[PDB]
Design a protein around this ligand. Structure first.
Ligand SMILES: CC[C@H](C)[C@@H]([C@@H](CC(=O)N1CCC[C@H]1[C@H](OC)[C@@H](C)C(=O)N[C@@H](Cc1ccccc1)c1nccs1)OC)N(C)C(=O)[C@@H](NC(=O)[C@H](C(C)C)N(C)C)C(C)C
Ligand SMILES: Nc1nc2c(ncn2[C@@H]2O[C@H](COP(=O)(O)OP(=O)(O)OP(=O)(O)O)[C@@H](O)[C@H]2O)c(=O)[nH]1
Ligand SMILES: Nc1ncnc2c1ncn2[C@@H]1O[C@H](COP(=O)(O)OP(=O)(O)NP(=O)(O)O)[C@@H](O)[C@H]1O
Ligand SMILES: Nc1nc2c(ncn2[C@@H]2O[C@H](COP(=O)(O)OP(=O)(O)O)[C@@H](O)[C@H]2O)c(=O)[nH]1
Ligand SMILES: [Mg+2]
Lengths: 430, 418, 440
């Protein structure tokens, strides 16, 4: 009975939430109107990790919608699932806040962050424990990257004895072409290197490349780029809400995959690949699945793992399957690979198994593999931040709101240091 | 033009409460017991009660450590000088003194029982300068910072930081007391006197700055009411660490600056419960910026800048005592994380292979010390380590760190121009 | 008389404790619903088997133990298990967080929140023991609450109750079933805290248990139930020398005198060789001359080591079931002729022996055959030091880069603890190395 409160900010965060919450309600056998209907009694074992009891056997979600522009509220209030959230779950203003980061961070955020913090306090007053809050935002437009970062920087002070979870959707030039995006990402990223110790580096470049190259869709809609992120994060958070031997509370996730407080950037993956609808694929053998996981084609970060190395590759398997199937080839994969696992860590790989499978697909798997090849992400952003800052164009949109010019060089130096730190462990053997 | 960080150690004088325990036990053993022993005729070895009634008139009240040498009765602990520091001269010291008790003498060539304890620990530590228990403030000043301040007015920068665990007198060593001065007071008085001596040939001006790193935040003790949320560290594009919204007051008279320093030091949080009311529960950085202006009005204008940094570091508090955990434990744990960052930075820097990274971007203190370690300034350490056997592993860890950081390289070229 | 007290700290401790309490409750004819047939006549008193259990007004024999675990999940499972009425409703329910795979968290931060109630309940149990003998604690090196709450509770109870004999049953970790990578740090720190306050500690290697359950028993991927049962068998074998008072019943305490030369060198091994699968045990019955010779084979140990190359300090054989003294002397004389067995050069004192007349039992629905001629060993050696060296090797690979240290440091612990514990274990290894030197 270790509770979590899910605060979601920004339009993209709101839609990822409206998809993921429906996925969870489907797996645990709760449909809209809040009632229980499933095909096993393992579902009610750890329902309180995410959901919450209410009167009349109603299992209302426990989450807050942060959205300034009121369009998303009307989108979700009559969406697929968003018809059960309590009336006071929503917090909103009467403005859009635009792509100007400082507009949401400094002048507009101060008006409504008080209400958001008050509602978070109210939610924390009803339970008896709190593992650590979870966030779903993106390093993109102003509203999300401002309000989410402000909520992190405040609630970290208000509850310092917790581990912070943030789901970051790193934006690429392909999925959107607003040229103030590298500035916003490069500045918002180092406001999370300090205040949160557990973040997932979901990439848009890799998502688009996979949805264009493997899946033959040629007009990738945002209703089909969400159907990879939602599934991946459900696979990530399968452990918490079902009983299991492996990590059953964030602190465990951190302690198993945070070698240092600064290097907490992962690259989640996915063994099968599914489009929306009722489409299905052939049955998967476990050796084929484990071989397919390692290769770069399924990675949701643009970096190539073959270039660098790994640190912790904690993995999860779904559905019904004999346990001894998984431990045979895995160790061999650990052996044939000469040097693509770091040595000075002992016992890198770890594995678990769960019973209830995903919706429709009866065999799948996930893994939260931390890596030292992730630098190619940030080493790319520096090439889309140094070019604009050498001529220092577009500053007057941010400088004319309250922020100085020192902070941008602070962010650039921070990213360079993080890249160098990740690079140093590449050849720092035992 | 190469330089080298130098080191200097201070040993606390025994406090009264444990001084009594020292006097009760250690004296007889050193003089006419373990120190010299006696012929094959000594009718009593060590159970004699002529040491201030250390034993009852009968059987021993408690189990002895060995051969009735110590642990004569039930108390909180023996707390003798069985493992202490030895200050034999002013260029070398030995820790874990050999042949301190006869039990060690029988523990040689005999069965390898408690063997290899002190034999493996036969390590001689060769520092630059050492101090005794009996020195006063002027004695430490006369060789810790006088060449350093001779350097600072010429143009070079300089830095000194405290060290060591709790109870070793870092605040008294540096920040002084309301009666006994520190090191900053003497430096300020000498700076004023050198200003007067060098007046009418070169004008000099000084600026003061003072900050603390409580709870890994930032605060300025010269000016409260500035919320820590406003204060942050930032950085220019040329490796500068100028904090925002520093007060940066300027003095004009000795009384003004000392009164302001006292008023600022009043605000630091401290533990009020135990007799150690001097317990500094936060780091502190004082900076004195000195700027010269020549008066010849002709060629050879040596317009030069310089700065001097004094740092007080809150000690590392282990689980020994420190009740009402959570509160005291959190205030201790943040300091522990900062000290871990400092130690990791030192260990990374001293090597010849990991130098390409030298991680400074860490907890706040390791960032504010960026210029201090590997920049341009000269540095001299002042590490306070207690000698009592009660604080043994504290002494060993602190002194091991002191042996570390003795091999640092920092090119210095002054701030001269024109 | 000699009422011991059993403590189980951590999930592994609670699992092994539930298995062992099931086994003991079944062996002595005590029903899971409390009552038993013999007390219909005896009623109660100070018999041999009343040492663990107790009496009450209704005769419900309440077990002498308190279950300690910061996670309320397993405590609820035991409360919701099959033994609802046996344990009195005073299990230490923890409605708060847990160590969560961190020794520092369990020791300092959250451990002090409940230690007062733990001491209160242990005192309530102890005060009913007129002749309290000692404490048998169950913990794990690599765990969370197991690593630290035990290391605190032992000190608190030792200071409170003076010098009483304390026994700890350890589960040294293995990489096949490791739930973490910080297990070495917890192991070294809790051994540093534990070495100077534990009379004797028993190493139940999980790798050895798993390997033996794979080879002897034919199960390919044994879940934790099989390991729990097989370890509970060893615990019952060692503990069965207290509940009975038959002839030749050398007491459990009297072994300690012959096992621990000095108070730091008290890590002995433990072997067991009646294990045979349920469906394959027929068509053969074992003899003592073969059983006692089987226990010396390296394949049936419970800490991976090679005593053949090293040296033997002492030995102690404990038999069970039905063995006549005429055979054991011949068996000992036979095995003494083996050249590979070599004793230390200052103690040829030979193999102390003990016999208990009671047949071993297994739970219904288990997997082990009901072999009557069960034998157990307890023999120190210099080969066990190799195990510690393995852990030290890990510490050399995960401390040059300072990995994971901040998690422990941020709970309220200095950095100096780790080097101190490492030097302590290095001293242990060197002490084990030096005892094997010749007497010349
Ligand atoms: C590859 C880049 C983007 C994928 C692309 C998508 C965006 C999109 O699909 N979007 C942007 C909001 C709307 C969404 C879809 O538009 C088609 C809409 C119908 C929808 O369904 N929106 C829903 C998703 C949904 C689906 C089903 C049910 C419920 C909801 C959302 N609600 C909230 C957030 S998204 O447009 C095809 N974008 C940004 C573009 O700007 C266009 N491409 C370009 O500009 C290219 C670059 C960017 C390649 N240029 C270089 C020339 C595009 C018109 C060809
Ligand atoms: N031999 C054996 N070992 C076990 C068993 N259950 C758990 N373990 C060991 O316990 C370790 C996991 O940590 P635990 O000792 O259980 O710690 P905990 O009791 O769960 O307490 P927390 O770590 O705070 O949750 C694993 O490395 C296992 O080796 C068991 O049934 N048999
Ligand atoms: N060299 C010294 N001469 C005289 N008194 C000393 C000396 N060193 C320490 N003391 C005394 O020892 C006590 C402890 O000093 P204190 O200032 O608390 O050390 P500290 O390390 O600065 N405090 P803390 O922040 O907890 O580490 C005070 O009463 C000092 O006066
Ligand atoms: N992967 C993914 N990214 C998205 C989606 N919607 C928006 N984004 C990203 O988020 C950014 C838009 O920020 P947004 O939250 O809309 O700002 P707001 O309009 O002020 O609330 C864009 O740059 C996109 O890269 C989505 O559905 N999926
Ligand atoms: Mg546990």
């Amino acid at each position: 009975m270790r509770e979590i409160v899910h605060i979601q900010a920004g339009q993209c965060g709101n839609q990822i939430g409206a998809k993921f919450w429906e996925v969870i309600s489907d797996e645990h056998g709760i449909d809209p109107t809040g009632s229980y209907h499933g095909d096993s009694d393992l579902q009610l074992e750890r329902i309180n990790v995410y959901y919450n009891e209410a009167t009349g056997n109603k299992y209302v979600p426990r989450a807050i919608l942060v959205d300034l522009e009121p369009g998303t509220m009307d989108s979700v209030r009559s969406g697929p699932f968003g018809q059960i959230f309590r009336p006071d779950n929503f917090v909103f203003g009467q403005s859009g806040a635009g792509n100007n980061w400082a507009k949401g961070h400094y002048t507009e955020g101060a008006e409504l962050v008080d209400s958001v913090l008050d509602v978070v306090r109210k939610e924390s007053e009803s339970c008896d424990c709190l593992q650590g809050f979870q966030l779903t935002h993106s390093l993109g437009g102003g509203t999300g990257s401002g309000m989410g970062t402000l909520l992190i920087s405040k609630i970290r002070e208000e509850y310092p004895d917790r581990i912070m979870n943030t789901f970051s959707v790193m934006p690429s030039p392909k999925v959107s072409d607003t040229v103030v995006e590298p500035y916003n990402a490069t500045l918002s990223v180092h406001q999370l290197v300090e205040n949160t110790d557990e973040t997932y580096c979901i990439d848009n470049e890799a998502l688009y490349d996979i949805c264009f190259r493997t899946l033959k869709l040629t007009t990738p809609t945002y209703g089909d780029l969400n159907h990879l992120v939602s599934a991946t994060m459900s696979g990530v958070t399968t452990c918490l809400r079902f009983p299991g031997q492996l990590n059953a509370d964030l602190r465990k996730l951190a302690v198993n995959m945070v070698p240092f407080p600064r290097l907490h950037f992962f690259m989640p993956g996915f063994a099968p690949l599914t489009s929306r609808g009722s489409q299905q694929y052939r049955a998967l053998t476990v050796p084929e699945l484990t071989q397919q996981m390692f290769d770069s084609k399924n990675m949701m970060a643009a970096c190539d793992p073959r270039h660098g190395r790994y640190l912790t590759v904690a993995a999860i398997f779904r559905g019904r399957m004999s346990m001894k199937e998984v431990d045979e080839q895995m160790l061999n994969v650990q052996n044939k690979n000469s040097s693509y696992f770091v040595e000075w860590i002992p016992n890198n790989v770890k594995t678990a198994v769960c019973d209830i499978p995903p919706r429709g697909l009866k065999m799948s798997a996930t893994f939260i593999g931390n890596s030292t090849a992730i630098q190619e992400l940030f080493k790319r952003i520096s090439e889309q931040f140094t070019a604009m800052f050498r001529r220092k164009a577009f500053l007057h949109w941010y400088t004319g709101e309250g922020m100085d010019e020192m902070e941008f060089t602070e962010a650039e130096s921070n990213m360079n240091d993080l890249v160098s730190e990740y690079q140093q462990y590449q050849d720092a053997t035992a | 033009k190469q330089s080298s960080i130098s080191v200097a150690v201070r040993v606390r004088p025994f406090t009264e409460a444990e001084s009594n325990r020292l006097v009760k036990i250690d004296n007889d053993d050193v003089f006419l017991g373990d120190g010299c022993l006696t012929s094959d005729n000594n009718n009593n070895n060590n159970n004699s009660n002529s040491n201030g009634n250390g034993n009852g008139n009968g059987s021993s009240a408690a189990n002895s450590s060995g051969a009735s040498t110590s642990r004569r009765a039930i108390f909180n602990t023996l707390g003798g000088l069985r493992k202490i520091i030895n200050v034999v001269d002013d260029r070398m010291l030995i820790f874990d003194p050999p042949e301190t008790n006869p039990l060690t003498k029988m523990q040689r060539n005999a069965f390898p029982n408690s063997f290899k304890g002190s034999r493996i620990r036969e390590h001689r530590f060769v520092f630059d300068r050492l101090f005794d228990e009996d020195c006063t403030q002027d004695q430490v000043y006369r060789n810790t910072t006088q060449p350093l301040l001779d350097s600072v007015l010429d143009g070079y920068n300089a830095t000194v930081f405290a060290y060591g665990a709790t109870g070793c007198g870092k605040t008294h060593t540096i920040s002084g007391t309301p009666e006994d001065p520190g090191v900053i007071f003497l430096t300020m008085k000498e700076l004023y006197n050198r200003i007067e001596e060098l007046k009418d040939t070169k004008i000099i001006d000084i600026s003061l700055s003072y900050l603390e790193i409580y709870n890994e935040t930032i605060r300025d003790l010269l000016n409260p009411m500035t919320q820590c949320k406003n204060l942050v560290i930032r950085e220019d594009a040329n490796n500068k660490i100028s904090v925002s919204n520093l007060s940066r007051h300027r003095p004009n008279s000795v009384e003004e600056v000392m009164q302001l320093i006292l008023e600022g030091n009043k605000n630091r949080t401290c533990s009020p419960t135990e007799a150690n009311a001097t317990s500094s529960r936060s780091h502190a950085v004082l900076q004195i910026n000195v700027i010269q202006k020549d008066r010849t009005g002709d060629i050879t204008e040596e317009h030069t800048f310089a700065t001097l940094s004094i740092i007080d570091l809150a000690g590392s508090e282990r689980a020994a005592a420190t009740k009402n955990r959570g509160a005291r434990l959190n205030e201790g744990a943040n300091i522990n994380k900062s000290l871990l960052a400092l130690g990791n930075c030192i260990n990374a820097l001293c090597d010849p292979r990991r130098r390409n990274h030298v991680p400074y971007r860490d907890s706040k203190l390791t960032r504010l010390l960026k210029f201090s370690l590997g920049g341009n300034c000269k540095t001299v350490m002042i590490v306070c380590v207690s000698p009592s056997s009660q604080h043994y592993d504290e002494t060993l860890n602190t002194l091991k760190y002191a042996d570390r950081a003795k091999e640092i390289k920092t090119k210095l070229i002054r701030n001269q121009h024109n | 008389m000699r009422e011991c007290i059993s403590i189980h700290v951590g999930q592994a401790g609670v699992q092994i404790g539930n298995a062992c309490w099931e086994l003991y409750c079944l062996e002595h004819g005590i029903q899971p619903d409390g009552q038993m047939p013999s007390d219909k006549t005896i009623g109660g008193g100070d018999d041999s088997f009343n040492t663990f259990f107790s009496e009450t007004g209704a005769g419900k024999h309440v077990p002498r133990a308190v279950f300690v675990d910061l996670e309320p999940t397993v405590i609820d499972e035991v409360r919701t298990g099959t033994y609802r009425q046996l344990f009195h409703p005073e299990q230490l329910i923890t409605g708060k967080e847990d160590a969560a795979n961190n020794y520092a968290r369990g020791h300092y931060t959250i451990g002090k929140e409940i230690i007062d109630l733990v001491l209160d309940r242990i005192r309530k149990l102890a005060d009913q023991c007129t002749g309290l003998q000692g404490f048998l604690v169950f913990h794990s090196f690599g765990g969370g609450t197991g690593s630290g709450f035990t290391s605190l509770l032992m000190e608190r109870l030792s200071v409170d109750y003076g010098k009483k004999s304390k026994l700890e049953f350890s589960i040294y970790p293995a990489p096949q079933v490791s739930t973490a990578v910080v297990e070495p740090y917890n192991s070294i720190l809790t051994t540093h805290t534990t070495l100077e306050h534990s009379d004797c500690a028993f190493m139940v290697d999980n790798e050895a248990i798993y390997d033996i359950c794979r080879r002897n028993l034919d199960i390919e991927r044994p879940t934790y139930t099989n390991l729990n049962r097989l370890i509970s068998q060893i615990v019952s074998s060692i503990t069965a020398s207290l509940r009975f008072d038959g002839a030749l019943n050398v007491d459990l305490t009297e072994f300690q005198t012959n096992l621990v030369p000095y108070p730091r060198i008290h890590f002995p091994l433990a072997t067991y060789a009646p294990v045979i699968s349920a469906e394959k045990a027929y068509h053969e019955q074992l003899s003592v001359a073969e059983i006692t010779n089987a226990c010396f084979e390296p394949a049936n140990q419970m800490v991976k080591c090679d005593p053949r190359h090293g040296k033997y300090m002492a030995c102690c054989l404990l038999y069970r079931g039905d063995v006549v003294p005429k055979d054991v002397n011949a068996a000992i004389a036979t095995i003494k002729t083996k050249r590979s067995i070599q004793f230390v050069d200052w103690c040829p004192t030979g193999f102390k022996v003990g016999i208990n007349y009671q047949p071993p039992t297994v739970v219904p629905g288990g997997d082990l055959a009901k072999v009557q001629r069960a034998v157990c060993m307890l023999s120190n050696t210099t080969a066990i030091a190799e195990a510690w060296a393995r852990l030290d090797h890990k510490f050399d690979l995960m401390y040059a880069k300072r990995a994971f240290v901040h998690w422990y440091v941020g709970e309220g612990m200095e950095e100096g603890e780790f080097s101190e514990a490492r030097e302590d274990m290095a001293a242990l290894e060197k002490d084990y190395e030096e005892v094997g030197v010749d007497s010349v």
